Symmetry: C3
Subunit: 273 residues, 3 copies
């Protein structure tokens, strides 16, 4: 129940659209950052190693109870910081750099998801056959604060982060989850752990060709909805969603705010017999 987690902050080139490279600010060389998974009640001992020689970075986990001005503080270039705090609430939480201006650090790529598994799981656990994590984020004009604050996103994208060995692990880009769809089998109930990290947009989350059997808002098992076509996610908003795929084919996964879908936010689930 004491968990020890280490990440680096670094600058990494990410191909966010075909032929379009963004010099992203990242945790562990991915944007969004690596998945973190803990159990409800765990105490996290988190170390951030700042490998950006130019600017400070920090870590804010939405899962934890912490003092932001003591526990989410900036770690200087080529220094490390270690912070300890509990994850007392089950669900699907955003994490991100909390260095001012926070919009600048998030928009440049410093966001991710931490999942906190509920003590007694979900009441539909037994029904689920397969699970994946999906994250939505936006990309803007490169490190352009005016665009971050006042412009529309250049791209809106999905990525998937591995829950277990063999799961895809991808970055937020307009194509990878079209070219290499997530995989499932006919008749399966799929669970997706989803978070919209923004920075700026809300998400109207919809899987084409199915209906969500069960939805747990922010992944807290108490927040139970049934039979939703589309799940409204605020910026930083999470959910656990579950649905059945009844026939073979490819099922798009979108935000239904179609300007964002048009700008990259469509992932594919390939369902085979």
């Amino acid at each position: 129940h004491d968990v020890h987690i280490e990440m680096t902050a670094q600058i990494t080139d990410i191909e966010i659209d075909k032929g379009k490279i963004y010099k992203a600010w990242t945790f562990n060389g991915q944007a969004p950052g690596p998945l973190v998974v803990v159990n409800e009640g765990d105490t996290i001992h988190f170390t951030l190693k700042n490998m950006d020689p130019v600017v400070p970075h920090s870590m804010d986990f939405h899962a934890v109870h912490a003092s932001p001005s003591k526990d989410f503080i900036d770690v200087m270039p080529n220094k490390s910081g270690t912070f300890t705090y509990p994850a007392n609430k089950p669900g699907v939480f955003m994490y991100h750099c909390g260095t001012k201006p926070v919009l600048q650090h998030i928009a440049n790529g410093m966001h991710g998801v931490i999942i906190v598994k509920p003590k007694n799981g979900y009441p539909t656990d037994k029904e689920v056959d397969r699970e994946y994590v999906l994250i939505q984020n936006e990309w803007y004009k490169y490190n352009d604060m005016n665009d971050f604050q006042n412009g529309v996103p250049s791209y809106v994208v999905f990525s998937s982060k591995a829950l277990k060995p063999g799961d895809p692990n991808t970055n937020g880009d307009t194509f990878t989850l079209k070219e290499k769809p997530l995989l499932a089998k006919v008749g399966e109930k799929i669970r997706l752990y989803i978070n919209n990290v923004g920075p700026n947009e809300v998400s109207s989350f919809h899987v084409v060709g199915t209906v969500f059997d069960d939805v747990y808002l922010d992944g807290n098992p108490n927040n139970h909805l049934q039979g939703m076509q589309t799940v409204m996610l605020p910026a930083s908003g999470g959910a656990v969603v579950e649905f059945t795929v009844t026939r073979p084919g490819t099922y798009p996964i979108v935000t239904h705010q179609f300007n964002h879908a048009q700008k990259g936010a469509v992932a594919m689930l390939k369902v085979t017999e």
Copy 2:
């Protein structure tokens, strides 16, 4: 049991604002399209007859479980296509054309609502005196993909679709439901089946002069809220909302995102003794 539905795709001029005609892409000569009502558990046998001589069109019902790559496929100009799928979930679901670019087809007018009536209705059925269906959509600069992707809506609008003969059946425009308000009587509980089809905006749905006694998110009877002033609808989001009108007068119906209201999204409800 088995329901057979035939609709056409065609181009239809729609006066979306006073003296402003939009050459809309439509189902059945209306934008949004005609209301479709079925019962929970029905199998739908849907035929789309494409009467557009230039562009393919298709049909995605949010109500159904289907293989999108087999059952939501394009129907070529001057052809028909028939697809069969179940509607196993109660609620107020969006439908729309699913032809790429989907944003273009939705924005041009190819959207609508299908209601799936719950097996046992709603726990508040006995309390309801009167019902209407309202849909919110946006209009952009005519068939302008840059405007669709990056621009603000030119108009945001409500329409009503007839559940009963002599309910109003209108298109998405800025003026019809102001000039010809919906009708009700003092003391009645009113139910609205509502959906925000977008394409791009979320909706903050509010009836002036009342509070929603009961709300069922996406029209599923299990998703029950009470005493809401305003209902957040994602793009494609639906609800069943119920409220009492206590006094004679005219009650505006709005999205409380007032930029949208100002750009046309105000309908009126005239309540008389």
Copy 3:
């Protein structure tokens, strides 16, 4: 109980950003307006005295059942009007000027919150140690209808309104709740009564360093969520949110739509031993 409330409509200079003065349209010389607090079941006898010499004004309370065309009607310059209506529903409700164009009156500053206390309070009343009221609003280019309808907000801001002597009572501005943080003590469970009055944006409401233990949507005790990281508020949407601060320090309060936080929407909560 019969409650008698009076406010004046007037023009008031407000420093919405450091060194930036907005000639606001206001209730009682504040924007947002003064807090109103009543009990569920109260009959409100409200008088508006319009001291604007040129423009009519009005009052629409989301809390009440009323005829908008009789009870929310315009009051002419230098005149008064008195209107009587019940507040039958518990929660945190927006109020605002209902004079056309409503977008202009809201955007210029004529918005506020009325709290309706539930007849039997909230099931978590016993756990709550301290309470505050926070309101989110936007500001645009001064009285510029094109910007109101089509532009991004220039500032997005929080204000606090007083429940008791010593509670901050502030205007919507970019700085006051940063310079003068809300106060709390380590270990306290804090209740916030919150409303996003818009006019145009939704809000992704989040307290940094904590998780909401309980959330009551629109402040109705029945609309109960648990363990939310972030609360989605439509334009005009309210909530009662409760959270624990476990450690000393300063905790930012944000909308997590970070373009808006960047443009002013960050308040501070300073937690001491």
